Design a protein around this ligand. Structure first.
Ligand SMILES: [Cl-]
Ligand SMILES: [Cl-]
Ligand SMILES: [Cl-]
Ligand SMILES: [Cl-]
Lengths: 323, 336, 336, 323
């Protein structure tokens, strides 16, 4: 189940065309290691629950009809959850391919399932804006249907946000940067490494980096577009270079700016300028880390903390529920 | 990298090498006092001390040290680094003292002996006696008050250290070479491989144990030092867990987690981390005195989701405790 | 690489650069006096002067020259190179004087103007007036006795040069920036692409002409500066061949080779090479006075077989003649 | 015709299984740009001669019978030669695959064709030793048949030596070595680059090098086998390194040892030792070359001169004709 990213799962559907049934935990009552929203793909070709689901998935594909299966998780071995099995038909295959393309573009997608009392999927939509949506939704504006759900008489609704690959833009390719690229890549970040020294940027130093761009910071910032939902990490160990990068990103709306060094050094970098809103110096959690490997953990832990802490503020689509 | 990995590198390629050691730090610096780095003839460097334009100057100094076959102390004002860059320098408001030593046939042999003792699990106390000019007069590798090796001609190196100026005479440098910290992981589920990778990369000796042989294939855990396929009860009987070890219980099986925890209860341990909720771990303890260093929920609370994030959270917690815990817990404390 | 390719590199990436020039050589050295090299901030170097551990020291000197924004002369005893290596040094029994100049906004602008004149086909006479300390007092780029540019404040740079000590006062350095030598190739058969590559790599401006459009596709000659599809008679009417040009006749068509040769007969030319035997070329001349610089069979006699080997043979012959031919054939000879 | 190497041509037969007819110039009378022994492959899917051969090749494949075609080359446009057309049948395909494998191993192969008066191929063999041969040879020892050929009454014989890729082992990966690798590779050498500095040995510096081995000279010489028919080029610009390489190769039987530098420097390298037999210092022809690009031409020209000058001594199989 919960071991593969949403974008890593939708990617699997693109390089397939193979018969597949998708499982989703739409409800959890009590204790479970797997959370609500966790997904899994059954391909028509480990654990007692997954083996029963395999048989159910096989039936769901043949019937070409979704079903909700309830499992009384109650056992002193840790083996009540509600699993939704949907056949990835030509319609849903097409819609999920469109979802993947929007996450590749960096845009999040709000998904909503309208379920029947029996547990069948009546309607489903993929929302981008207050008007822009796609899917098998025949009844009104999906957004207006969600806001107008009844307190107790309307719990036959499932929502999930398909979040794109988070980007981590790293300024510097020194020998302390390869562990950070590895840890950030493994956790699920899209990593961009940029430095002006071509010998520092050989691909064998950063095999997990999605992009390695050899350029002076000023050229990079001119050519490469930095999105406001991106994470910037300045660790060149060159004052003038760090100052060149920071001064450019100053008025730019940015989620995170982390600078490797002391508060005094960052104060010196900002000489004669107003600091940006989401500046983190010293970078990473204070775990008194020593060396590149430990500092890299400290940085990635902080990123995870901020992605998950600001995910309690419902940041991508919270604006579609106020007014 | 790690002391044992740096000393491992000397056993390999056998080529001219100069060893750089930060013997003193004043102010702010990327690395702390005791940090090492290898300057090699092949133009490669093993480790970093600044990450700036400092390494560029040391390379030239290292080349001179090898030719002269004479150690040297180089002092770097990292703030006034404009006298080393194409730009405004590093910017770090600190001054570091780097000691460059040629890894000659004598020191090569001594460091190979240090490595063999760390492979055996024995720590080594290293001491250097420096001259006023900054060269190395004497050096020793201590195992006990009487047992020592190296290039030490005067008296008992141990008695020379205890009878020093005060909080170290500036002409003395000490460093303890210790073996890797051990991380004993109970469970081989698909959430354990990222934890093994992150813990291995940060410098832990990793032991993975589970009773299910197909979850324990070596390709799942290529960074694990040991993969032992056994029932927890057999593992605990056969494999000795020392008090300085780190235990991580993540089998996702209540009865299994309960036999592991109940065994380790009275055993003095550095760390016990159990994957799950405080309520689950209360049920696991089933009215027992909790161990002194029990961590449930495991890892720092960064609201981690998925195996990859939980693994970062745990390694973060492990780093925090190794670095927070009183540095006056050395294996050569008994000596002083 | 070539002067025009080195000056081309300054027009691009626009980053801190220090220019190294060999202003004097005593004894044996890999490069001759006038050889240049670029030290860049990105850690890349454009050209070489020794290829040893010299470049490693210059990099540090270049970094200082940029910071100080002041030129410097560095003298290297290449024999006593043990004071620069991990080993016994270079071994070359020579002493070189390297002049390091920061490519400041002023010099960047002047060198961009030099490049534009070489693109136009006009050579540029460069002169540096050095101080006793080895710094640069003045420098100029001469086009004619009166027309000059740069950072020259005293008199007429031309009159300053002619009125020097004798065979140059040690405080004077001169260098002629000339455009690429032209190699005009008649024929686009499958034996011509290796010759275009080897001639292009060595520094020739290559022009390929043939009357058969499918042999002249650009993918066959990616290194050719010009590919002109025309009958030889039309090419010779339209394209001007200067006396300092190099001609290579290799159409494998007797009548075509004969119209090309008969046209170039009275025309003063640096070089005319015809692919084939002396007998064939005797038949081509059909009782005519052979040109002064006719080479048939073409290339050095190394008993070459196939297009690739014949191409080496021809480029070898071309190099031999450019280097053998009297150096007192400069375009600024008329000035002195 | 003569534009593709023998080994480059036999390679083409391995990645084929496609119907193919091989042409060979078995005789030349007078003037021709193409020499005797030149080969070409016609595949059953530029110039007037090649177009006629294409039609003849098509007939030869259908008939599955070799034929000799004579072309009166006499024309004042340069358009008498004897072309042999042989269908690359399953038998010959198999034999030529074996020839290729021996050239990959570095062993030369002596080929002989026994032709009829009509121009058909009666017999053919591929000789390695005084006893070791393979092919479609039914009559005696091919070697003894060749030595005992009649002065004038036996010219119905064609011989050709299939020579392996010549190896050029370059010690040094400085910025002067990439043009030499390119020129040597283009002319047809198997190039091996070795240096002890990994940053000097990135593959993008030497894309034409067959092997790039990062090692100290002493380790290279221990691990990599140097054949007596190999060409060694010492150009590390490091005296101690060049001395380490030369001292090892001293008693070793070697075709060519070229050292970049002066005779005095090479004399200093050989301090207290007898120089090897095929030492070339200064390396390359004296064309007063300046810079890496010109020196590289000078070196490759010398190599070509020595391969072709010692090819007049019939070096690979001259020993099978003396005694
Ligand atoms: Cl900088
Ligand atoms: Cl309890
Ligand atoms: Cl050396
Ligand atoms: Cl004549």
């Amino acid at each position: 189940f919960q071991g593969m990213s949403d974008i890593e799962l939708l990617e699997t559907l693109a390089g397939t065309d193979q018969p597949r049934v998708m499982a989703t935990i739409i409800h959890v009552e009590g204790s479970s290691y797997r959370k609500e929203g966790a997904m899994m793909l059954f391909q028509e070709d480990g654990g007692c629950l997954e083996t029963d689901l395999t048989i159910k998935a096989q039936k769901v594909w043949q019937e070409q009809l979704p079903r909700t299966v309830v499992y009384d998780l109650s056992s002193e071995d840790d083996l009540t959850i509600s699993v939704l099995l949907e056949p990835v038909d030509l319609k849903l295959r097409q819609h999920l391919k469109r979802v993947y393309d929007y996450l590749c573009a960096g845009k999040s997608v709000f998904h909503v399932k309208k379920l029947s009392t029996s547990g069948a999927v009546l309607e489903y939509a993929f929302i981008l804006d207050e008007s822009v949506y796609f899917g098998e939704w025949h009844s009104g504006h999906p957004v207006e249907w969600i806001r107008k759900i009844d307190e107790n008489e309307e719990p036959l609704m499932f929502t999930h946000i398909y979040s794109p690959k988070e980007r981590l833009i790293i300024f510097g390719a020194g020998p302390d940067v390869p562990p950070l690229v590895t840890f950030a890549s493994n956790v699920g970040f899209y990593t961009v490494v940029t430095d002006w020294r071509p010998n520092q940027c050989e691909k064998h130093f950063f095999p997990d980096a999605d992009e390695i761009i050899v350029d002076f910071p000023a050229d990079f910032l001119r050519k490469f577009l930095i999105r406001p939902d991106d994470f910037v990490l300045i660790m060149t160990h060159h004052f003038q270079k760090d100052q060149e990068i920071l001064h450019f990103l100053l008025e730019k709306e940015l989620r995170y700016i982390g600078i490797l060094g002391s508060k005094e050094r960052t104060r010196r970098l900002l000489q004669n300028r107003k600091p940006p809103d989401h500046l983190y110096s010293p970078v990473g959690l204070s775990i008194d880390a020593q060396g590149p490997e430990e500092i890299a953990i400290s940085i990635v832990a902080q990123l995870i903390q901020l992605i998950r802490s600001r995910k309690q503020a419902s940041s991508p689509f919270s604006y579609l529920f106020q007014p």
